Amino acid sequence: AVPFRRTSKMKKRLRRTHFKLNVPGMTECPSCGEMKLSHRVCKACGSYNGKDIN
Amino acid sequence: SYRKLGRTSAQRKAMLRDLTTDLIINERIETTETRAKELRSVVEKMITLGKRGDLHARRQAAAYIRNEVANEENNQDALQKLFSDIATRYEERQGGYTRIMKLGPRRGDGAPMAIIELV
Amino acid sequence: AAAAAAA
RNA sequence: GCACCUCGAUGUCGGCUCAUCGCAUCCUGGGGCUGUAGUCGGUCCCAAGGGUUGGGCUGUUCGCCCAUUAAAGCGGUACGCGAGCUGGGUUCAGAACGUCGUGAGACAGUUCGGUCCCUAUCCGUCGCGGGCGCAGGAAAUUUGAGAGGAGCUGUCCUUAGUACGAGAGGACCGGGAUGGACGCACCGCUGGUGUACCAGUUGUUCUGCCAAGGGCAUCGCUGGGUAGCUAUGUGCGGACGGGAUAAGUGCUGAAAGCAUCUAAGCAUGAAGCCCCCCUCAAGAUGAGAUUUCCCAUUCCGCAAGGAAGUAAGAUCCCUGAAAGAUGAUCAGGUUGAUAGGUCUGAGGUGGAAGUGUGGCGACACAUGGAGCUGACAGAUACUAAUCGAUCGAGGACUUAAC
RNA sequence: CCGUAAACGGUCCUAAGGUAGCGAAAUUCCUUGUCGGGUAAGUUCCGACCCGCACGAAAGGCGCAACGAUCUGGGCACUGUCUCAACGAGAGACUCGGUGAAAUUAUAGUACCUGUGAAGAUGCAGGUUACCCGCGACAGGACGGAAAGACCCCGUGGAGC
RNA sequence: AGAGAACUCUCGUUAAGGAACUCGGCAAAAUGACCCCGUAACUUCGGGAGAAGGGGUGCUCUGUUAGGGUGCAAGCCCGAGAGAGCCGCAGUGAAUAGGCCCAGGCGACUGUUUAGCAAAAACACAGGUCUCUGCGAAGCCGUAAGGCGAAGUAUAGGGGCU
RNA sequence: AAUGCCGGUAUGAGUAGCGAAAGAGGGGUGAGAAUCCCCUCCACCGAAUGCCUAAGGUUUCCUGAGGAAGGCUCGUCCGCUCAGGGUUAGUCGGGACCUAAGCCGAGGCCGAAAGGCGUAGGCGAUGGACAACAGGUUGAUAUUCCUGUACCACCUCCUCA
RNA sequence: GUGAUCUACCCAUGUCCAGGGUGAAGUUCAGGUAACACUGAAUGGAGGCCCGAACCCACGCACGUUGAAAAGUGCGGGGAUGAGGUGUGGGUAGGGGUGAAAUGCCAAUCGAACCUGGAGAUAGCUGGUUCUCUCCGAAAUAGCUUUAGGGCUAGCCUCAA
RNA sequence: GUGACCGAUAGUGAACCAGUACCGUGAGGGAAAGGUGAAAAGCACCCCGGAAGGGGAGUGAAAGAGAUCCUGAAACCGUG
RNA sequence: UUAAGUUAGAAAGGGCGCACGGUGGAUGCCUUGGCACUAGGAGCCGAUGAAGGACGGGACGAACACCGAUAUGCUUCGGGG
């Protein structure tokens, strides 16, 4: 449970290839925008298909 | 299979009763999404219990509704509110008395929040 | 002896 | 035996778990010689494919004994395996017995008791993903270079009480059932579990009180139990067979006019081998094959090539499980049953509340197979799967016919 | 030591050679001594034989009711200790949001087999395999890490008795 | 926050067997509450002994029971032990309150000890025995003064062994 | 190149951990709320997880602002920061009362020196004596502040026997 | 020189031990002696007594072992009116104290506590010892040695005359 | 008054609120930490931001000189 | 269009070089303080209360220095403007 050798810079950067995170499913809000993530109520106008329900 | 929601079964029952009654008075509450999904079936089952209107269904509902005041300056309990307003409002509708609308994640823990309302 | 009793 | 490696540490016995390898083979398979009448045997060959046990004693390996078995085989892998496990014995600090020593103390002599740390960096292994390649982009179906899994056997009946044998005894070969161990699946039964199912019941508190219920007391306790997961439950497998073979048995035959299993040519022959049984398999860079869609835009770069939109198709996002740590897979996204709700059922529990009757009452009876019911079915868009967005090709050059 | 059936006789030696009571023992190398009980099977246990290496009479001997967080055997009840494991609940582990270390570390693009070598190789030789980068697990190796081995030896080192 | 993977820990059940496990019933399970009957070997006659082994507990009435406590009385508390019954698989219905028996070793016993590895057979213990000491005692702490012993006086102090 | 010293920065790694045990919702403030305030349910302790009172800490207590760092996350909040404020006694505890163990100790007895011991005397509570209770009051003090009734010790410019 | 604010023992003065049982000595009434003895009931409530809470302790297992903790937690366990626990104030100090005796304890320290000096103790032992080029170039042998991994002299090397 | 004495890991432990902070019951042990500019002339004013912190505009010889503030290396972290 | 060959480009990310930055206080200057001394002086202060401290004193918030209820001081004699 003890590291025998230190990790080099290149192996660390190769391990950090998949550490990035993705862009969310964000779309144009039909009321005002911009923008609104899919299948959630818009935080700006408080509308959802298409009534102001807050 | 139902969710456990990170609680003991007694804590699960107490939290579900609290959320059911609080939805029944305030008519719109904001919880997490999985709590909403676990809550909506119980809430529509209790509305279905309120549909019957007899004494046995009311005594079944009294074992689940907590004793909090529903309507101020009227001394109406929540158990009276199910059998006076909600049952008469949803007499024609057959199921689907609640809807869940998702919000963004919470600041403190990244919890996806949801709006629950009686429709 | 070789007793493994390291503390 | 030596002291080559380790004393700025290579944990040492015996057990548990997991195994793997070599036959100098314990059984099973095929044979030769027997002072092998048959069964059972003895010795020597070929053969590692598979299997080679449950206890009593002792820390014990070993060993003895009990009961089986087809047999309970020898060894290597740091006397395999303690960053996988236990410390009973060795092997600390305490205290005794016997012996030695004036003594402090000592004893491969005995006994009682005695702290076993580590969050895995890399290679290894077991699973699951994301890229790019496979000279266009896709959706399916696949061949198999290779690899892994499996490979064990008992008992009974016929042949036949036949061959053989004075008798007792008693077959080889060939068929048919039934088992043990192991393995793969799945529960329809038998059971287990089933913390959002049903009922009974104790103490206290609460819903103002009776009644009826809620909270806590291990799910308070007790008696059952749907789905799922399960074995101790059920079904199935190691079947029938081909090719070249080992030890053996040979045929025809000369070197060597004979003889001869061999030097040429042909056979037969084992649970060994390579297949037939099952599974993964074109990153098999040697990137394979068949079927069916989409088409050959625009703008720069005079050539190579590079950007934008798109078709076929796929993804982001959402409903979920026959899947699952997360990804992934699968069923689906409003010309629809994907999940929840509602209704009707299956199954479970066992006769709800209220009312009435009988009783002084605890209680019983009728309404009434009642009431309740978590994941199990079938209907039903009532609710949520909205609007949307992103990725995704214009197909290099030679050679023979077109 | 030698005879004779503990006990008596002959001899050496000393101050004199173990009395009673126990005895294969917290004491017995041989040894799992022999016999019997307990069990189907008992290197442990119990009761006797003496064959006491190397019991023994206030470093007390032999018994002993009650007592013991003591040790060693055997029974009833009881059970997941296993035959032989299967479910269920909670916490961690898994995912996401916030915060965020440590031991260790010559550099490292860090396969396998057989040999070779300071005699046990990820890096050497010959061969066999292997597209790139991650995530969840196991721990065979890196003679893994942690402590200038505690054992053994040496020092004309030390300390306690 | 949410999924309810492996594995680790704390728990709860489990068919048919049961200690076949293991160094060793370690751990776990089981009994354990109140009342009644009964209780062996042995013994220092105190014990062992809650030995072992068996039976019954819930609720209603007869029932402000019989009998006691209190008070001037009415009235409020403690209330056995029984007869009619009523329910459930289950009645100290939950939670806390012994697992027993036989035969041996050692130590009598209660107690004390290696704070942080060993709680024991070790130490201690009343009793037993030996030895020293006549008081300004012996033996101790101090160069001494001073003091403990002891404001005690051989039935008293100190030391050794058991 | 000393298992060197000091300072800085990596690896492990976005990894282990975030330290027993119930939270849920609706309003409010605010740039920002799962963590701050209010309300309603629900839950836990209850021979305590309740009340106070020593030792100890010493400002940590109250109010108004603030959020840098410290809250193992966040923070509009805090035992954090800055400004101000708060502790009232003849009767409570101690001292102008007493003494035990022990300590100091004029003169004094010893001792190279330094000092050690010890009368008279004193110190020394954990003990003995001793006089105030019931209500209210602030955001912070209560047998101390206030309104009632009291009690203890001491003294007379006074009045009585 | 500094320490008994942890702990070992002692001194003085306080305080704590919910409940439920067993039941002694003694006394009374009977059976009973001339007067004692012995037995059965009543009273009595002794015990380094029993079961069991607070309190103290550490026997078994498990977890933790870069822990919530430099010794704990959970489930059981032992003592629990006494050789008891505990508070306050004191005393014994390191060739010393204290010790129901373990080589235990004396501030996470003990076969001789800690701090400061002698002191930069000593170490025939291990590690380390910092720029370059050129010329030459060893030995691992003998003797002696409390000597065997050290030293001295010869042997072998280098420079100059 | 002088150094073929030191220059901030050096020189007194201490060039700086140093025998200080801190550690230990105590005796005792004992740090780290200098530099804007010649002159604060220490960035008036505008914009983003709750603030911190930036971008302009000014002072300045220099603002990359802006409060651990002269010069600013390497390990380390990043973007093309 | 088929069949057989031969090549380029591919980058999730990475390596090397270059450019531009951040962290940090090495280096270089630099003393406000030290280390050795030299030539002289001084080598004691205290019951007429010492050395060393505690607590205080400023309009103003804490500390250093200074001072002491006459308290960030008070007299006399000189220097200096």
Short mmCIF file of all heavy atoms in Angstrom, two decimals, chain D residues 109-125:
data_model
loop_
_atom_site.label_atom_id
_atom_site.label_comp_id
_atom_site.label_asym_id
_atom_site.label_seq_id
_atom_site.Cartn_x
_atom_site.Cartn_y
_atom_site.Cartn_z
P G D 109 15.97 -31.87 25.25
OP1 G D 109 17.39 -32.30 25.28
OP2 G D 109 14.90 -32.89 25.13
"O5'" G D 109 15.69 -31.02 26.57
"C5'" G D 109 14.43 -30.41 26.80
"C4'" G D 109 13.62 -31.20 27.80
"O4'" G D 109 14.27 -31.16 29.10
"C3'" G D 109 12.22 -30.69 28.08
"O3'" G D 109 11.27 -31.05 27.09
"C2'" G D 109 11.93 -31.28 29.45
"O2'" G D 109 11.61 -32.66 29.33
"C1'" G D 109 13.29 -31.16 30.12
N9 G D 109 13.41 -29.89 30.87
C8 G D 109 14.24 -28.84 30.58
N7 G D 109 14.12 -27.85 31.42
C5 G D 109 13.16 -28.28 32.33
C6 G D 109 12.61 -27.63 33.46
O6 G D 109 12.88 -26.51 33.92
N1 G D 109 11.66 -28.41 34.10
C2 G D 109 11.28 -29.66 33.69
N2 G D 109 10.34 -30.28 34.43
N3 G D 109 11.78 -30.28 32.64
C4 G D 109 12.71 -29.53 32.00
P U D 110 10.08 -30.04 26.71
OP1 U D 110 9.36 -30.60 25.53
OP2 U D 110 10.64 -28.67 26.65
"O5'" U D 110 9.09 -30.11 27.96
"C5'" U D 110 8.40 -31.31 28.28
"C4'" U D 110 7.62 -31.19 29.56
"O4'" U D 110 8.50 -30.83 30.66
"C3'" U D 110 6.54 -30.11 29.59
"O3'" U D 110 5.35 -30.51 28.94
"C2'" U D 110 6.36 -29.87 31.08
"O2'" U D 110 5.55 -30.87 31.66
"C1'" U D 110 7.79 -30.04 31.60
N1 U D 110 8.50 -28.75 31.78
C2 U D 110 8.16 -27.92 32.85
O2 U D 110 7.29 -28.16 33.66
N3 U D 110 8.88 -26.76 32.93
C4 U D 110 9.89 -26.35 32.09
O4 U D 110 10.46 -25.27 32.29
C5 U D 110 10.19 -27.26 31.03
C6 U D 110 9.51 -28.40 30.92
P U D 111 4.42 -29.41 28.23
OP1 U D 111 3.35 -30.13 27.48
OP2 U D 111 5.30 -28.46 27.51
"O5'" U D 111 3.73 -28.63 29.43
"C5'" U D 111 2.81 -29.27 30.30
"C4'" U D 111 2.39 -28.37 31.43
"O4'" U D 111 3.53 -28.04 32.26
"C3'" U D 111 1.83 -27.02 31.02
"O3'" U D 111 0.47 -27.09 30.63
"C2'" U D 111 2.06 -26.17 32.27
"O2'" U D 111 1.06 -26.42 33.24
"C1'" U D 111 3.39 -26.74 32.78
N1 U D 111 4.57 -25.93 32.40
C2 U D 111 4.86 -24.78 33.13
O2 U D 111 4.18 -24.38 34.06
N3 U D 111 5.97 -24.10 32.73
C4 U D 111 6.83 -24.43 31.71
O4 U D 111 7.80 -23.71 31.47
C5 U D 111 6.48 -25.62 31.01
C6 U D 111 5.40 -26.32 31.38
P C D 112 -0.12 -26.01 29.60
OP1 C D 112 -1.39 -26.55 29.04
OP2 C D 112 0.97 -25.60 28.69
"O5'" C D 112 -0.48 -24.76 30.53
"C5'" C D 112 -1.41 -24.89 31.59
"C4'" C D 112 -1.48 -23.64 32.42
"O4'" C D 112 -0.25 -23.48 33.17
"C3'" C D 112 -1.60 -22.34 31.64
"O3'" C D 112 -2.91 -22.07 31.17
"C2'" C D 112 -1.07 -21.31 32.64
"O2'" C D 112 -2.07 -21.00 33.60
"C1'" C D 112 0.04 -22.10 33.33
N1 C D 112 1.38 -21.81 32.77
C2 C D 112 2.08 -20.71 33.27
O2 C D 112 1.56 -20.02 34.16
N3 C D 112 3.31 -20.42 32.78
C4 C D 112 3.84 -21.18 31.82
N4 C D 112 5.05 -20.85 31.36
C5 C D 112 3.16 -22.31 31.29
C6 C D 112 1.95 -22.58 31.79
P G D 113 -3.12 -21.56 29.67
OP1 G D 113 -4.58 -21.61 29.37
OP2 G D 113 -2.17 -22.29 28.80
"O5'" G D 113 -2.68 -20.04 29.71
"C5'" G D 113 -3.43 -19.08 30.44
"C4'" G D 113 -2.73 -17.75 30.51
"O4'" G D 113 -1.50 -17.87 31.27
"C3'" G D 113 -2.28 -17.15 29.18
"O3'" G D 113 -3.32 -16.52 28.46
"C2'" G D 113 -1.18 -16.20 29.62
"O2'" G D 113 -1.73 -15.01 30.17
"C1'" G D 113 -0.53 -16.99 30.75
N9 G D 113 0.62 -17.78 30.27
C8 G D 113 0.64 -19.09 29.89
N7 G D 113 1.82 -19.51 29.52
C5 G D 113 2.63 -18.40 29.67
C6 G D 113 4.02 -18.23 29.42
O6 G D 113 4.83 -19.06 29.01
N1 G D 113 4.44 -16.94 29.70
C2 G D 113 3.64 -15.93 30.17
N2 G D 113 4.23 -14.75 30.38
N3 G D 113 2.34 -16.07 30.40
C4 G D 113 1.91 -17.32 30.13
P G D 114 -3.29 -16.49 26.86
OP1 G D 114 -4.59 -15.96 26.38
OP2 G D 114 -2.83 -17.82 26.40
"O5'" G D 114 -2.15 -15.43 26.50
"C5'" G D 114 -2.37 -14.04 26.71
"C4'" G D 114 -1.07 -13.26 26.70
"O4'" G D 114 -0.09 -13.93 27.54
"C3'" G D 114 -0.37 -13.11 25.36
"O3'" G D 114 -0.93 -12.08 24.56
"C2'" G D 114 1.07 -12.85 25.77
"O2'" G D 114 1.24 -11.50 26.18
"C1'" G D 114 1.20 -13.74 27.01
N9 G D 114 1.77 -15.06 26.67
C8 G D 114 1.08 -16.21 26.37
N7 G D 114 1.86 -17.22 26.10
C5 G D 114 3.14 -16.71 26.23
C6 G D 114 4.40 -17.33 26.07
O6 G D 114 4.65 -18.51 25.76
N1 G D 114 5.45 -16.45 26.29
C2 G D 114 5.30 -15.13 26.64
N2 G D 114 6.44 -14.45 26.82
N3 G D 114 4.13 -14.53 26.80
C4 G D 114 3.10 -15.37 26.58
P U D 115 -0.92 -12.21 22.96
OP1 U D 115 -1.89 -13.27 22.59
OP2 U D 115 0.49 -12.31 22.51
"O5'" U D 115 -1.50 -10.82 22.47
"C5'" U D 115 -0.85 -9.59 22.80
"C4'" U D 115 -1.25 -8.49 21.85
"O4'" U D 115 -0.96 -7.20 22.46
"C3'" U D 115 -0.53 -8.49 20.50
"O3'" U D 115 -1.44 -8.08 19.48
"C2'" U D 115 0.54 -7.42 20.68
"O2'" U D 115 0.99 -6.82 19.48
"C1'" U D 115 -0.19 -6.42 21.57
N1 U D 115 0.70 -5.55 22.36
C2 U D 115 0.20 -4.31 22.71
O2 U D 115 -0.93 -3.95 22.42
N3 U D 115 1.05 -3.53 23.44
C4 U D 115 2.34 -3.84 23.82
O4 U D 115 2.99 -3.02 24.48
C5 U D 115 2.79 -5.13 23.41
C6 U D 115 1.97 -5.92 22.70
P C D 116 -2.12 -9.17 18.51
OP1 C D 116 -3.59 -9.07 18.66
OP2 C D 116 -1.45 -10.48 18.75
"O5'" C D 116 -1.73 -8.68 17.05
"C5'" C D 116 -0.41 -8.26 16.74
"C4'" C D 116 -0.06 -8.48 15.29
"O4'" C D 116 0.87 -9.59 15.18
"C3'" C D 116 -1.24 -8.82 14.37
"O3'" C D 116 -1.01 -8.23 13.09
"C2'" C D 116 -1.15 -10.33 14.25
"O2'" C D 116 -1.73 -10.87 13.08
"C1'" C D 116 0.36 -10.55 14.28
N1 C D 116 0.77 -11.88 14.74
C2 C D 116 1.67 -12.61 13.96
O2 C D 116 2.08 -12.11 12.91
N3 C D 116 2.06 -13.84 14.37
C4 C D 116 1.59 -14.34 15.51
N4 C D 116 2.00 -15.55 15.88
C5 C D 116 0.67 -13.62 16.33
C6 C D 116 0.29 -12.40 15.91
P C D 117 -2.13 -7.32 12.40
OP1 C D 117 -3.26 -7.18 13.34
OP2 C D 117 -2.37 -7.84 11.03
"O5'" C D 117 -1.43 -5.89 12.26
"C5'" C D 117 -1.77 -4.81 13.12
"C4'" C D 117 -1.36 -3.50 12.51
"O4'" C D 117 0.08 -3.35 12.62
"C3'" C D 117 -1.65 -3.34 11.03
"O3'" C D 117 -2.98 -2.93 10.78
"C2'" C D 117 -0.61 -2.32 10.59
"O2'" C D 117 -1.04 -1.00 10.89
"C1'" C D 117 0.58 -2.65 11.49
N1 C D 117 1.62 -3.49 10.84
C2 C D 117 2.51 -2.93 9.91
O2 C D 117 2.42 -1.73 9.61
N3 C D 117 3.46 -3.72 9.35
C4 C D 117 3.56 -5.00 9.69
N4 C D 117 4.51 -5.74 9.12
C5 C D 117 2.67 -5.59 10.64
C6 C D 117 1.74 -4.81 11.18
P C D 118 -3.75 -3.42 9.46
OP1 C D 118 -5.17 -3.00 9.58
OP2 C D 118 -3.43 -4.85 9.24
"O5'" C D 118 -3.09 -2.58 8.28
"C5'" C D 118 -3.26 -1.17 8.20
"C4'" C D 118 -2.42 -0.57 7.11
"O4'" C D 118 -1.02 -0.83 7.38
"C3'" C D 118 -2.63 -1.13 5.71
"O3'" C D 118 -3.75 -0.55 5.06
"C2'" C D 118 -1.31 -0.83 5.01
"O2'" C D 118 -1.28 0.51 4.55
"C1'" C D 118 -0.31 -0.97 6.17
N1 C D 118 0.40 -2.27 6.16
C2 C D 118 1.54 -2.42 5.35
O2 C D 118 1.92 -1.47 4.65
N3 C D 118 2.20 -3.60 5.34
C4 C D 118 1.78 -4.61 6.10
N4 C D 118 2.47 -5.75 6.06
C5 C D 118 0.64 -4.49 6.94
C6 C D 118 -0.01 -3.32 6.94
P U D 119 -4.90 -1.49 4.43
OP1 U D 119 -5.87 -1.81 5.51
OP2 U D 119 -4.23 -2.59 3.69
"O5'" U D 119 -5.63 -0.55 3.37
"C5'" U D 119 -6.22 0.68 3.77
"C4'" U D 119 -6.44 1.61 2.60
"O4'" U D 119 -6.78 2.93 3.12
"C3'" U D 119 -5.23 1.81 1.70
"O3'" U D 119 -5.68 2.09 0.37
"C2'" U D 119 -4.59 3.05 2.29
"O2'" U D 119 -3.75 3.76 1.40
"C1'" U D 119 -5.81 3.87 2.68
N1 U D 119 -5.58 4.82 3.77
C2 U D 119 -5.37 6.14 3.43
O2 U D 119 -5.37 6.53 2.27
N3 U D 119 -5.15 6.99 4.48
C4 U D 119 -5.13 6.66 5.82
O4 U D 119 -4.92 7.54 6.65
C5 U D 119 -5.35 5.27 6.09
C6 U D 119 -5.57 4.42 5.08
P A D 120 -5.64 0.96 -0.77
OP1 A D 120 -6.44 1.45 -1.92
OP2 A D 120 -5.97 -0.34 -0.15
"O5'" A D 120 -4.12 0.92 -1.23
"C5'" A D 120 -3.53 2.02 -1.92
"C4'" A D 120 -2.70 1.56 -3.10
"O4'" A D 120 -1.95 0.37 -2.74
"C3'" A D 120 -3.49 1.20 -4.36
"O3'" A D 120 -2.73 1.56 -5.52
"C2'" A D 120 -3.58 -0.32 -4.28
"O2'" A D 120 -3.77 -0.97 -5.51
"C1'" A D 120 -2.24 -0.67 -3.65
N9 A D 120 -2.23 -1.95 -2.94
C8 A D 120 -3.11 -2.39 -1.99
N7 A D 120 -2.83 -3.59 -1.53
C5 A D 120 -1.69 -3.95 -2.22
C6 A D 120 -0.89 -5.11 -2.21
N6 A D 120 -1.13 -6.16 -1.42
N1 A D 120 0.18 -5.15 -3.03
C2 A D 120 0.43 -4.10 -3.82
N3 A D 120 -0.25 -2.97 -3.93
C4 A D 120 -1.31 -2.95 -3.09
P U D 121 -3.01 2.94 -6.28
OP1 U D 121 -3.97 3.72 -5.47
OP2 U D 121 -3.33 2.63 -7.70
"O5'" U D 121 -1.60 3.68 -6.25
"C5'" U D 121 -1.32 4.77 -7.12
"C4'" U D 121 0.07 4.65 -7.70
"O4'" U D 121 1.03 4.40 -6.64
"C3'" U D 121 0.28 3.50 -8.67
"O3'" U D 121 -0.16 3.80 -9.98
"C2'" U D 121 1.78 3.25 -8.57
"O2'" U D 121 2.49 4.20 -9.35
"C1'" U D 121 2.05 3.54 -7.10
N1 U D 121 2.06 2.32 -6.24
C2 U D 121 3.06 1.35 -6.34
O2 U D 121 3.99 1.37 -7.13
N3 U D 121 2.93 0.29 -5.47
C4 U D 121 1.94 0.11 -4.52
O4 U D 121 1.94 -0.88 -3.79
C5 U D 121 0.97 1.15 -4.46
C6 U D 121 1.07 2.19 -5.30
P C D 122 -0.77 2.65 -10.92
OP1 C D 122 -1.36 3.29 -12.12
OP2 C D 122 -1.61 1.76 -10.08
"O5'" C D 122 0.50 1.82 -11.40
"C5'" C D 122 1.51 2.43 -12.19
"C4'" C D 122 2.68 1.49 -12.39
"O4'" C D 122 3.32 1.23 -11.12
"C3'" C D 122 2.33 0.11 -12.91
"O3'" C D 122 2.11 0.07 -14.31
"C2'" C D 122 3.52 -0.72 -12.45
"O2'" C D 122 4.64 -0.50 -13.30
"C1'" C D 122 3.82 -0.09 -11.09
N1 C D 122 3.19 -0.83 -9.96
C2 C D 122 3.68 -2.07 -9.51
O2 C D 122 4.66 -2.59 -10.07
N3 C D 122 3.07 -2.68 -8.47
C4 C D 122 2.02 -2.12 -7.87
N4 C D 122 1.44 -2.75 -6.84
C5 C D 122 1.50 -0.88 -8.29
C6 C D 122 2.12 -0.27 -9.31
P C D 123 0.99 -0.90 -14.92
OP1 C D 123 0.78 -0.53 -16.34
OP2 C D 123 -0.16 -0.92 -13.99
"O5'" C D 123 1.67 -2.34 -14.89
"C5'" C D 123 2.85 -2.59 -15.64
"C4'" C D 123 3.56 -3.85 -15.19
"O4'" C D 123 3.88 -3.78 -13.77
"C3'" C D 123 2.77 -5.13 -15.33
"O3'" C D 123 2.76 -5.63 -16.65
"C2'" C D 123 3.47 -6.06 -14.34
"O2'" C D 123 4.67 -6.59 -14.90
"C1'" C D 123 3.85 -5.08 -13.22
N1 C D 123 2.90 -5.12 -12.08
C2 C D 123 2.77 -6.24 -11.23
O2 C D 123 3.48 -7.25 -11.41
N3 C D 123 1.88 -6.19 -10.22
C4 C D 123 1.14 -5.10 -10.01
N4 C D 123 0.27 -5.10 -9.00
C5 C D 123 1.24 -3.96 -10.85
C6 C D 123 2.12 -4.01 -11.85
P G D 124 1.58 -6.61 -17.14
OP1 G D 124 1.71 -6.80 -18.60
OP2 G D 124 0.30 -6.11 -16.58
"O5'" G D 124 1.92 -8.00 -16.43
"C5'" G D 124 0.92 -8.98 -16.26
"C4'" G D 124 1.00 -9.64 -14.90
"O4'" G D 124 1.13 -8.65 -13.86
"C3'" G D 124 -0.23 -10.44 -14.51
"O3'" G D 124 -0.21 -11.74 -15.05
"C2'" G D 124 -0.20 -10.42 -12.98
"O2'" G D 124 0.60 -11.48 -12.49
"C1'" G D 124 0.51 -9.10 -12.68
N9 G D 124 -0.36 -8.03 -12.15
C8 G D 124 -0.31 -6.73 -12.60
N7 G D 124 -1.13 -5.93 -12.00
C5 G D 124 -1.76 -6.73 -11.05
C6 G D 124 -2.75 -6.38 -10.10
O6 G D 124 -3.27 -5.28 -9.91
N1 G D 124 -3.14 -7.47 -9.34
C2 G D 124 -2.63 -8.73 -9.47
N2 G D 124 -3.12 -9.67 -8.64
N3 G D 124 -1.70 -9.07 -10.35
C4 G D 124 -1.30 -8.03 -11.12
P U D 125 -1.13 -12.12 -16.31
OP1 U D 125 -0.36 -13.02 -17.20
OP2 U D 125 -1.72 -10.87 -16.84
"O5'" U D 125 -2.31 -12.95 -15.65
"C5'" U D 125 -3.62 -12.41 -15.62
"C4'" U D 125 -4.29 -12.63 -14.30
"O4'" U D 125 -3.75 -11.71 -13.31
"C3'" U D 125 -5.78 -12.35 -14.30
"O3'" U D 125 -6.52 -13.45 -14.78
"C2'" U D 125 -6.07 -12.01 -12.84
"O2'" U D 125 -6.19 -13.19 -12.06
"C1'" U D 125 -4.78 -11.29 -12.43
N1 U D 125 -4.87 -9.80 -12.48
C2 U D 125 -5.70 -9.09 -11.62
O2 U D 125 -6.45 -9.57 -10.80
N3 U D 125 -5.67 -7.73 -11.75
C4 U D 125 -4.89 -7.00 -12.61
O4 U D 125 -4.96 -5.77 -12.61
C5 U D 125 -4.04 -7.78 -13.45
C6 U D 125 -4.05 -9.12 -13.35
#
